[PDB]
Amino acid sequence: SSLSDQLAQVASNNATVALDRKRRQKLHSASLIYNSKTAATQDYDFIFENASKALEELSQIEPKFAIFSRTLFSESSISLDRNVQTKEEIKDLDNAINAYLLLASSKWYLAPTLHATEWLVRRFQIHVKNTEMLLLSTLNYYQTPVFKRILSIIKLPPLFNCLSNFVRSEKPPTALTMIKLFNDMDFLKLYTSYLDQCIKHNATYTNQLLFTTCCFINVVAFNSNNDEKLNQLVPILLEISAKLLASKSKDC
Amino acid sequence: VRKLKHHEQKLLKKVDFLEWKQDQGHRDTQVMRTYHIQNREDYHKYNRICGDIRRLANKLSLLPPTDPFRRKHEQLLLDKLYAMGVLTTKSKISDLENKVTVSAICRRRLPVIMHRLKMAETIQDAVKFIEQGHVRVGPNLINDPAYLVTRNMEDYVTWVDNSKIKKTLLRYRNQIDDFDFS
Amino acid sequence: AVPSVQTFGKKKSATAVAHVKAGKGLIKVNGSPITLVEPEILRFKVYEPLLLVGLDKFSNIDIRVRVTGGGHVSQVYAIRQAIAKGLVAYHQKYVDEQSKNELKKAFTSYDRTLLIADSRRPEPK
Amino acid sequence: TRKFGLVKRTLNTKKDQRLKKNQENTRNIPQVSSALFFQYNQAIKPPY
Amino acid sequence: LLITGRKGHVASMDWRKGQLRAELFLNETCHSATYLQNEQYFAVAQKKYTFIYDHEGTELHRLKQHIEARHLDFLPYHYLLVTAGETGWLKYHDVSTGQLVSELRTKAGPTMAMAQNPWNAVM
Amino acid sequence: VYSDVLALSMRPDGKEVAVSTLKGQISIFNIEDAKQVGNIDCRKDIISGRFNQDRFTAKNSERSKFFTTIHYSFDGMAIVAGGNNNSICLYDVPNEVLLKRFIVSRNMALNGTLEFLNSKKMTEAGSLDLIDDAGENSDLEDRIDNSLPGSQRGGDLSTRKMRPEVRVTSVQFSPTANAFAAASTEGLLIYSTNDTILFDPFDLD
Amino acid sequence: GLKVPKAVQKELPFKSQIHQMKPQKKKTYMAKRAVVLGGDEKKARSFIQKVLTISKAKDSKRKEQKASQRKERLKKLAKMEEEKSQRDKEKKKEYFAQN
RNA sequence: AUAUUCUUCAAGUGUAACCUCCUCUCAAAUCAGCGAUAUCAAACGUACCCCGUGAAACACCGGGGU
RNA sequence: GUCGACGUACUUCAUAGGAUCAUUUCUAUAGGAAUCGUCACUCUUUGACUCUUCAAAAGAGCCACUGAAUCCAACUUGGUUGAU
């Protein structure tokens, strides 16, 4: 290809690597709670105080968050940057954070999860590295003001190209544009592999599991003409509903 | 660099990264813009000739004045340098050292002549029409923008026939004739 | 849009602006049919580009001709010039090329004045 | 689809700001004095 | 990083991050280039004339001198661009003032290999 | 005539004149009368090259679609024409149809050969033939570009800074033996029939 | 005003072709549409056209008053220039009469 | 020091270092001011009938219309 | 016939007192202000980059597969109990 195509490919792989001070003051400045001026002037040490104080409240709501204070939200996990570590160790940082956003996604209306994930946003760079499991865990809150903030950070993946006009928009992403997401044949194959991952931990909640079907009904509805499109659709949908019946949960 | 301070100034009275005495005022760039010439080495390909005029002017000035060689020989040369059209008048013999400039030889360029004869609107736009292939000299169309044109040959530049730019001109006067397929 | 071709025709000081477009087969001169040209003896001097090549080739086209200048005769040499030029410059544009060289060889053998303006520029002896 | 009349990008001198010589880029009418007459200067009195 | 094609690339990339400062396509051949005093000012060795470029791709100077340049080097404590081409001569161009310091006849023919000494600034 | 004429030639009868205008078309006039016998159309059957430095398709450039020479055969029945194009022609004069079209040369080295250049030569900034390979060369004498700026068809071949164009300048028939020589860029061509490996019978029973 | 002959006006170069708008005869729809406020607005649209007439002519008379006194002042000014011209000649004799 | 190496001074219509003037200021074109042949609208002017105000004036009060 | 001599008439010739900038410190003068390893925010100027108007011109050309946007046809939903 050209030069500037290949030389912008290096930019994606070093999207988090703070090199100049101005590169740091753009990456560190974006976050969930604080605005762009007051975010850049605070340590990780400041953020870890508010997180570990908030995370102990979430441990009181349910004891499942107690384990992450041993590993991710521990005091020793301030010095570790992602970029310094090997390739095997990063996938364990993903598999902790992927296990975290399952438990986080249920208590998402509450104020302490907003202060809890933000240290896991700003120290662990989940708004760049793994924004699929960040967004797929929080895809059902599209009307809420917390998801409007989540859009205002993330460089959107190539699969979520329907929401790309709603990044840093005034009004929330409307209900039909959520269907244009699920109308794609590839974006469903995430939301299968998100859900069959979510059932195995048996943490699937009521408002989430409605918004799955309320999209999965409409995908059948928008494709009720094209009999070819439906023919390639049910290896995606019926294999969910096969595994969605295997659940212990009556609600699933 | 920095708009260095007053005490920085006096130690760096002479440093400058943009403008050098070697660079000679950037005269070569300054006339490349006014005539819009494509490749950079084109200037000093003329300025070697335009200097070689003056070196022949100088040694022909060092011959004694009542020499029927010397009186014959620069008037032999001003015949040619006026026919080619680099210099405006034939009368002065000291035009040959004073008025022979590169900007004189760089305005018998073809796109300047298409701007002098009011063919194209500007001088960049004439390069745009030469490179696309709308202009011609007699039979054959010309495609190098940097075609020198003799003052004698300056009569014969026209738009190339059946072109889409000689068709539009004839529509303005409501005088097309498609038996010519203009 | 509309496929048209504009050709000129010129005798002494008379122009002839013949627009030729694809149509039904009407042939007008100054907003009047060609069967009503003035001098009435020279009406067959303008039927020459109709009848030399054959009247079939006008079945799909329109010939709008408007003339100014000249006299009674020297306009009739302008409408026979601009109809011949307007016919033979529509077959090189919007119909087939081999039609055109059949026409340009037909008008040539009959009278070359149909195509190119016979300019009677002076001569000093 | 490359543009026509392309030329090597080079340094403007008449327009650029980094050059030293190109780095550079309410009326006032003083009232004639309230002392002064046409030429008489009616204020000056001894001591001077 | 600075790279030069033998045919026409000159790319003054930033390298860690993915930004691209200047990409000049030169239809003359090009042999070598170095950054002179920062990332900002670099100097390619063209077909005949060593040019001095800027971070945007601008020309700053067409060096009339340095009339062949196969091997081109800078040494940073003297602001002193050095060339040695296929002409034997060895020229040092003090790029702060623009005044050529010293032109040196090598007597040995076309310079096949040149590299500076960092400790000493002899070459 | 209709457009600029160039390169006339007269039949050895002394009664006809063959012309080559700039519209491509070759016309044949009488002399004792001013009228014309006929004209033969040459704009289509001319092959034209796209040069390396061009910006137009080879189909719609007006460089080479006329004929800068014509010569009647001594029979008075055939015209050979040749211009700044890549092709030579043999028109029959009464039947008004070309007989055979000769490509002068097939060289990538010369410019006016190809109707269609390769696409892999076109890099985003420019063709990969216009790049100066002159500085790569080992000797001194090759590297010295002394080409004057806009010198076309000039004095030496060094002073072009272009590849040489394809043009057939002047064409004549032979007097004797069905030959005709066309003077090219590559050098003077000679076409002939001295083979006679051909079965051209006449009145066979 | 000058009226260019049309045979001169026809073969003019494109830079200088004189723009002469033909009058319109077939009534436009817009000139059959638009509303003109009458009554009270007419008394306040006649008046603005009656004020701007006064202030254009009060300017173009007082602006003419300056160029009437410009002509008088430069006649008085050149008379002072002529005395400083001739007397400056006389000093450079009485200077060089010493030298 | 025992022909080269090193050193000192002198001279060169010697100089691709270094000083200096030229190699820019067009038989050019745009934009801005000015502004004509013209144009659209409005007002005002002339004549002509109509309506309000008024008791009324061929109203010397206002208005509408062609 | 033209050129001198004399007379007449006009044109022309000399400036001086200061101050600052000019040398990689120093223009000669002590009567003068400038030696600092920078971290932020605001504001202004210039440059690219993508579209683009006055306004075109030319397409390194042709095929094959896959993807998208617009415009009708169709269908569905809402719509005189009021769509635009």
UniProtKB/Swiss-Prot annotation, chain A:
PTM annotation (N-acetylserine): residues: S1
Subcellular location: Nucleus, Nucleolus; Mitochondrion
Recorded superkingdom: Eukaryota
Role played: Involved in nucleolar processing of pre-18S ribosomal RNA. Required for optimal pre-ribosomal RNA transcription by RNA polymerase I together with a subset of U3 proteins required for transcription (t-UTPs). Involved in ribosome biosynthesis.
Family: Belongs to the HEATR1/UTP10 family.
Quaternary structure and interacting proteins, as annotated: Interacts with snoRNA U3. Interacts with MPP10. Component of the ribosomal small subunit (SSU) processome composed of at least 40 protein subunits and snoRNA U3. In the absence of snoRNA3, forms a complex with other t-UTPs. This complex can associate with pre-18S ribosomal RNAs.
Note: Present with 18200 molecules/cell in log phase SD medium.
Name of the protein: U3 small nucleolar RNA-associated protein 10
Gene, per the UniProt record: UTP10
Residue range from the parent sequence: 2 to 253 of 1769
Curated annotation (Swiss-Prot), chain B:
Family assignment from sequence similarity: Belongs to the universal ribosomal protein uS4 family.
Subunit structure as annotated in this protein's UniProt entry: Component of a heterotrimeric complex containing IMP3, IMP4 and MPP10. Interacts with MPP10. Component of the ribosomal small subunit (SSU) processome composed of at least 40 protein subunits and snoRNA U3.
Localisation per UniProt entry: Nucleus, Nucleolus
Pfam families: Ribosomal_S4, S4
Entry-linked SUPFAM superfamilies: Alpha-L RNA-binding motif
Domain S4 RNA-binding: 108-174
Protein's name according to its UniProt entry: U3 small nucleolar ribonucleoprotein protein IMP3
UniProtKB keywords: Nucleus, Ribonucleoprotein, Ribosome biogenesis, RNA-binding, rRNA processing, rRNA-binding
Molecular function per GO: RNA folding chaperone; rRNA binding; snoRNA binding
Function statement: Required for the early cleavages at sites A0, A1 and A2 during 18S ribosomal pre-RNA processing.
Biological processes per GO annotation: maturation of SSU-rRNA; ribosomal small subunit biogenesis; rRNA processing
Gene Ontology cellular-component annotations: 90S preribosome; Mpp10 complex; nucleolus; nucleoplasm; small-subunit processome
PANTHER family, alphabetized: 30S 40S RIBOSOMAL PROTEIN (PTHR11831), U3 SMALL NUCLEOLAR RIBONUCLEOPROTEIN PROTEIN IMP3 (PTHR11831:SF1)
Superkingdom: Eukaryota
Curated annotation (Swiss-Prot), chain D:
Location within or outside the cell: Nucleus, Nucleolus
Subunit annotation: Interacts with FAF1.
Annotated function: Essential protein involved in pre-rRNA processing and 40S ribosomal subunit assembly. Required for the early cleavage steps of 35S rRNA at the A(0), A(1), and A(2) sites.
Family stated for the protein in its record: Belongs to the UTP23/FCF1 family. FCF1 subfamily.
Protein name from the UniProt record: rRNA-processing protein FCF1
Swiss-Prot record, chain G:
Function in brief: GTPase required for synthesis of 40S ribosomal subunits and for processing the 35S pre-rRNA at sites A0, A1, and A2. Controls access of pre-ribosomal RNA intermediates to RCL1 during ribosome biogenesis by binding of RCL1 in a GTP-dependent manner and, via its affinity to U3 snoRNA, delivering it to pre-ribosomes. GTP-binding and/or GTP hydrolysis may induce conformational rearrangements within the BMS1-RCL1 complex allowing the interaction of RCL1 with its RNA substrate. Required for RCL1 import into the nucleus.
Positions with biased composition (Basic and acidic residues): 58-71, 78-95
Annotated segments matching region Disordered: 58-99
Protein name: Ribosome biogenesis protein BMS1
Location relative to the cell: Cytoplasm; Nucleus, Nucleolus
Included range, full protein: 1066 to 1164 of 1183
Self-association and partners: Interacts directly with RCL1 and the U3 snoRNA to form a stable subcomplex. Component of the 90S small subunit processome also known as 90S pre-ribosome that consists of the 35S pre-rRNA, early-associating ribosomal proteins most of which are part of the small ribosomal subunit, the U3 snoRNA and associated proteins.
Species of origin: Saccharomyces cerevisiae (strain ATCC 204508 / S288c) (Baker's yeast)
Family classification: Belongs to the TRAFAC class translation factor GTPase superfamily. Bms1-like GTPase family. BMS1 subfamily.
